[PDB]
Amino acid sequence: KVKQLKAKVEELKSKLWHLKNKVARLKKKNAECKA
Amino acid sequence: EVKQLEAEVEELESELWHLENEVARLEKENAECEA
């Protein structure tokens, strides 16, 4: 069990990092176009 | 452990949900500004 979870925890952390990176990019691109 | 990891999984999943909503919004803000 603890293994399977640790596994999910890790998969979730990586997806979170990818999404924050994508969000930081869209905000910067949206700022750029706006002004 | 187990309880600790389920909480962790729960907390990562929530944060992802918010980011997924934000990504979806930002992408649309971007499509409009550029279209």
Architecture blueprint of SSEs:
The complex is a heterodimer of chains A (35) and B (35).
Chain A: H1 2-34
Chain B: H1 2-34
What can you see in these coordinates?
- The complex is a heterodimer of chains A (35) and B (35).
- Chain A is mostly helical and 35 residues long.
- Chain A is built from one helix and no strands.
- Chain A has one domain.
- Chain A is rod-shaped and about 50 Å long.
- Chain B has 35 residues and is mainly alpha-helical.
- Chain B has one domain.
- The longest helix of chain B has 33 residues.
- The radius of gyration of chain B is 15 Å and the shape is rod-shaped.
- In chain B, 0% of the residues are buried.
- Chains A and B meet through helix 1 of A and helix 1 of B.
Give a quick summary of the entry.
The complex is a heterodimer of chains A (35) and B (35). With 35 residues, chain A is mostly helical. In chain A, 94% of the residues lie in helices and 0% in strands.
What is the terminal-to-terminal distance of chain B? Answer: 50 Å
Helical stretch tally of chain B? 1
Q: Quickly give the structural class of chain A.
A: mainly alpha
Number of helices in the DSSP assignment of chain A: 1
Per DSSP, what share of the residues of chain A sits in E-state strands of 2 or more residues?
A: under 5%
Report the count of strand segments of chain A.
Answer: 0
- The percent range for helix content of chain B is over 70%
**Radius of gyration from the alpha-carbon trace of chain A, in angstroms:** 15 Å
Structural class of chain B: mainly alpha
User: What about the largest sheet of chain B?
Assistant: none
Shape of chain A: rod-shaped
Morphology call of chain B: rod-shaped
Q: What is the first-to-last residue Cα distance of chain A?
A: 51 Å
